Amino acid sequence: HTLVWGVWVNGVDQGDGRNIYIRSPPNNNPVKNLTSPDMTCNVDNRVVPKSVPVNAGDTLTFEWYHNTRDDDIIASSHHGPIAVYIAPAASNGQGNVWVKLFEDAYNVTNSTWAVDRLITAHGQHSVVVPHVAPGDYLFRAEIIALHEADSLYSQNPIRGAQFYISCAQITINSSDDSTPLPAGVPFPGAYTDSTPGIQFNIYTTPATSYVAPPPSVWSGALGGSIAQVGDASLE
Ligand SMILES: O[C@@H]1[C@@H](O)[C@H](O[C@@H]2CO[C@@H](O[C@@H]3CO[C@@H](O[C@@H]4CO[C@@H](O[C@@H]5CO[C@@H](O)[C@H](O)[C@H]5O)[C@H](O)[C@H]4O)[C@H](O)[C@H]3O)[C@H](O)[C@H]2O)OC[C@H]1O
Ligand SMILES: *[C@@H]1O[C@H](CO)[C@@H](O)[C@H](O)[C@H]1NC(C)=O
Ligand SMILES: *[C@@H]1O[C@H](CO)[C@@H](O)[C@H](O)[C@H]1NC(C)=O
Ligand SMILES: [Cl-]
Ligand SMILES: [Cl-]
Ligand SMILES: [Cl-]
Ligand SMILES: [Cl-]
Ligand SMILES: [Cl-]
Ligand SMILES: [Cl-]
Ligand SMILES: [Cl-]
Ligand SMILES: [Cl-]
Ligand SMILES: [Cl-]
Ligand SMILES: [Cu+2]
Hints:
By secondary structure, the chain is mainly β. It has helices spanning about 40, 115-120, and strands spanning about 5-10, 10-15, 50-55, 60-65, 80-90, 100-105, 105, 110-115, 125-130, 135-145, 160-170, 225. The longest helix is centred in the middle third of the chain and has 7 residues, at about 115-120. One 2-acetamido-2-deoxy-beta-D-glucopyranose binds near residues 33, 35, 36 and 157. It is found in: Secreted.
């Protein structure tokens, strides 16, 4: 159970974005139905009044929280991967439009899942803004908690993988458009019951065996990380 508070750009807090530049749902409940329109941008997908200005090569940091800002972030039991997708805003997230910019599942050296490191990072994870066409975009951050992913929601609606999905409105101003955005995948649609990484038993299968759900990260992506960039408590 987790939500996005706001974003930072180049290490500078953009301010509380809830219902402003984040298409925030009313609470931190997961989405579980892979076929639902809620998979796109969660349960209250509508245009919000602001879009955060960035330039290609900027560091965009999402900041998550549980109940209040800079708390325990997400329950420790919710082990699983983190991904970030991008789509043009004109799509409203519909169609074959979502391109993956970032994936982190399990780090063998550290023996930690992405969620574990998100907690340590005070909720913060980043992507570098790619050299796509200037314009308005949606950035879709997605945490998959796997604690009940041994079952499929479609079969047992009280269990299943849990998706914590947040869409930020981002305007890319300066970019050369040297890496124009390629074809993407649909949400809902890209994940099905048989997709690698949707049904998995974290308790009995080694975490090193885990494969996150495709698509693969786009070759034009410029990187990212799960790491604290700013101290919320100084404000
Ligand atoms: O040996 C292994 C077994 O142990 C393994 O069992 C699994 C263990 O984990 C089980 O899942 C737990 C389900 O309950 C979650 O706690 C809930 C989370 O939600 C809380 O409510 C929200 C809190 O946040 C507020 O903001 C929000 O308003 C609330 O709605 C609620 O209070 C908690 O009870 C635990 O985090 C999960 O760990 C799982 O079902 C078992 O299968 O099975 C495999 C076996 O090998
Ligand atoms: C899952 O979503 C689809 C598509 O909106 C819907 O038809 C179906 O009833 C949902 N399943 C549940 C259990 O609500
Ligand atoms: C691995 O753990 C060390 C200390 O435990 C930490 O400094 C480092 O950031 C971790 N790696 C990642 C990818 O966070
Ligand atoms: Cl603020
Ligand atoms: Cl759902
Ligand atoms: Cl604006
Ligand atoms: Cl708060
Ligand atoms: Cl919790
Ligand atoms: Cl950190
Ligand atoms: Cl739960
Ligand atoms: Cl550029
Ligand atoms: Cl980064
Ligand atoms: Cu939860």
